[PDB]
Design a protein around this ligand. Structure first.
Ligand code: EF2
Ligand code: ZN
Length: 112
């Protein structure tokens, strides 16, 4: 516990929608940070979270190109502005589900 913490909540960088919390970071494979690339060669610094809110999960899951063995992904947009914030992963084991969010698309700041 700290008084007046400034690194508590992650919001959408583009609009401020509440998305996640530092307390919910999830060390997948021993690290909450996973640096990965997609088939279009884009590099993402992905932070894994157990939980997130304020997103909209688009479509149905796919296992194609999944960065996390045993998980299928759905695109996760900011539910307010539509910014692509990351992916929701499901269908796996321990945990069954989690979120992989793009670190530089979030803003971190004080609690609400
Ligand atoms: O775990 C994942 C999530 C999605 C992701 N990915 C993308 O970022 C992407 C962009 C364009 C076409 C196809 C893909 C897809 O598989 C990817 O490569 N792995
Ligand atoms: Zn947003």
């Amino acid at each position: 516990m700290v008084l007046a913490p400034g690194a508590s909540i992650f919001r959408c960088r583009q609009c401020g929608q509440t998305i996640s919390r530092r307390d919910w970071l999830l060390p997948m494979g021993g690290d909450h940070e996973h640096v990965v690339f997609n088939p279009a060669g884009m590099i993402f610094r992905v932070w894994c979270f157990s939980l997130a809110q304020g997103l909209r999960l688009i479509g149905a899951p796919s296992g194609e190109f999944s960065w996390f063995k045993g998980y299928d992904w759905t695109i996760a947009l900011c539910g307010q502005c539509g910014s692509h914030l990351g992916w929701h992963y499901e269908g796996g084991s321990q945990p069954q589900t989690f979120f992989g969010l793009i670190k530089d698309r979030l803003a971190e700041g004080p609690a609400d």
